[PDB]
Scaffold this active site. Structure first.
Site, mmCIF file in Angstrom:
data_model
loop_
_atom_site.group_PDB
_atom_site.id
_atom_site.type_symbol
_atom_site.label_atom_id
_atom_site.label_comp_id
_atom_site.label_asym_id
_atom_site.label_seq_id
_atom_site.Cartn_x
_atom_site.Cartn_y
_atom_site.Cartn_z
ATOM 1 C CD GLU B 174 33.691 27.036 51.548
ATOM 2 O OE1 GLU B 174 33.424 25.873 51.748
ATOM 3 O OE2 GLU B 174 33.922 27.803 52.458
ATOM 4 C CD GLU B 312 37.373 23.219 56.085
ATOM 5 O OE1 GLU B 312 38.133 22.230 56.162
ATOM 6 O OE2 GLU B 312 37.275 24.070 57.000
#
Ligand SMILES: [Cl-]
Lengths: 344, 336
Positions: B174, B312
């Site tokens: 994310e 991420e």
């Protein structure tokens, strides 16, 4: 004349390039991320920047060196596999069917199998570095003479340095040897001032109800030989074995080359303890891989002051865990080389 | 026309027990002491139970990164300026982010999905944008229940399409400034922990705990209802990651977790359908304070001790190597 002396090789082991590490830190701190958010991957990239043998975090060519030998202490009934499995499994390595073979191939690493003391003749496809046909039984006497240990350290460090000159960028260590977790535990006990009951594990599925006998054998090996815990060569010669000596030599040679060497599991921890006793500057070239499931793993790792990256419950050896961590060496260099900072 | 969430979930099945029993036999027979490759063996066995896989073929891997901005940014809890979400999303397209270079090194694709960035439409990014940032969970719900359900459907549907296109291993990641605050809220609610245990002396930490406490008190989410928790105190990126897990499980394919944010999504995914848990593969032990509590409630133990907290999807990329290695061992090790 033929080879360098051990003393001369040791004196070429340099501390890490602290200025290079500082430049690497500054670069990593400036990248597109919160500061220190890649944690030990950043630490690894900085550690590698300090190794003068490398250039530009280029680590393509990798080589796991597997040291194979039989052990006289097999006679004490501390291993469940037939002793002949050392020889057959070394041949299986040549065939490319063992666990380290397939994990090394998966990591793009070469495997170099070296016979330093198998109880057999020369094996096709296995490097002849054989000191003897098996070590002495450490429960009744020394594994080898001090001179044999020193000469094997020189020979295996020299091989490693030759491979370094040939272009290997990252080394790993592995071993093959029925009953070799018994000398390994004896070495760990001696180096860490631990009672053998804390350091002796099940190895290759030794029955837990018979583990007390393996402890007794290790205790007797230490009592018989009385090794000097401060003397890495003495501990190797008295309660070690040829495979353990060979792995120590690879670590010494990689550090002398200024190159990283990736540890495996418990057997390699014992060799690493001996290497650091021989020259403390070797420690900063070591890269831990996985946390071995051997009972004495945590004690050995604490004394090395190393924290492995992988918690896989693995206990095979052969260098299979070192193969897995090669991906992490790749990842640290890929992050260092390819990650953006101010591309726009 | 779109499928219902219920119709997607119905496809999620328990692992194939007989296939896992046969894998255990095969592994015990390899040229090694029984059990000596430990968690690598159990990973190959877990993969044998996933009916979407064939022959431990895991060549094609895809990390889906869900990007969104968060209303609770208004409370001042983010460490960086809000615009970072948009800028980092654009850096993903260029391939210069941490997950991009680590995924490349692992041979995985990265798919960057906008589910709620506070920006105009972004080139190179998949437009799944629900809104320009979520609602402020400190003052009300992140989104309506319908919004959460429709985004679960959309993100699971996307994942299922990727499965039909040949992806064998999924990962999640994310991007979202301030999203550790909704993540802490969800973990607090799901694990029945005070936010002080889940939020990671300083004035900022004290304020962040208070904001999470207020979000829970304002919204009173129903902890037994994964969608309610996501809608009330989650965010669009967290919903999307949950949707990827549901879609991968529905396809019978593994999905590799990242760090703290993905644990919150996984807790929600398992509330929604318990059978999803068996398709989860943990990656690294996130250095986030609440990571241990979340992992304990998922009953997962990560493989990698990297002290990482980037997120991420970077940790998921690293674990792809282990999925690869487990299958290589299973397929290539010699027996008799
Ligand atoms: Cl006895």
């Amino acid at each position: 004349q033929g080879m360098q002396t051990l003393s001369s090789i040791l004196r070429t082991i340099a501390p890490l390039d602290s200025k290079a590490m500082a430049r690497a830190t500054t670069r990593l701190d400036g990248l597109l991320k919160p500061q220190g958010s890649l944690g030990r991957l950043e630490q690894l990239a900085i550690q590698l920047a300090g190794m003068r043998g490398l250039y530009g975090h280029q680590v393509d060519r990798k080589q796991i060196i597997v040291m194979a030998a039989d052990h006289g202490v097999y006679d004490e009934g501390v291993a469940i596999s037939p002793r002949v499995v050392t020889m057959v499994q070394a041949l299986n390595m040549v065939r490319g069917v063992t666990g380290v073979c397939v994990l090394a191939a998966n990591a793009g690493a070469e495997v170099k199998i070296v016979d330093v003391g198998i109880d057999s003749d020369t094996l096709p496809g296995v490097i002849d570095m054989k000191v003897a046909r098996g070590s002495g039984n450490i429960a009744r006497g020394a594994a080898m003479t001090r001179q044999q240990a020193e000469d094997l350290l020189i020979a295996s460090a020299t091989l490693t340095l030759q491979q370094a000159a040939g272009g290997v960028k990252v080394f790993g260590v592995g071993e093959l040897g029925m009953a070799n977790t018994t000398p390994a535990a004896a070495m760990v006990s001696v180096f860490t001032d631990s009672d053998p009951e804390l350091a002796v594990g099940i190895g290759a599925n030794f029955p837990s109800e018979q583990l007390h006998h393996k402890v007794a054998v290790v205790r007797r090996a230490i009592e018989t030989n009385q090794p000097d815990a401060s003397d890495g060569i003495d501990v190797l010669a008295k309660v070690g074995g040829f495979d353990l000596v060979g792995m120590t030599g690879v670590m010494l040679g990689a550090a002398a080359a200024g190159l990283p060497v990736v540890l495996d599991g418990f057997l390699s921890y014992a060799s690493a303890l001996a290497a650091c006793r021989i020259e403390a500057k070797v420690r900063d070239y070591l890269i831990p891989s996985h946390l071995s499931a051997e009972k004495g793993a945590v004690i050995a790792l604490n004394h090395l002051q190393l924290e492995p990256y992988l918690q896989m419950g693995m206990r095979l050896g052969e260098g299979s865990g070192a193969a897995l961590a090669m991906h992490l060496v790749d990842a640290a260099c890929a992050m260092y080389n390819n990650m953006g900072s101010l591309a726009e």
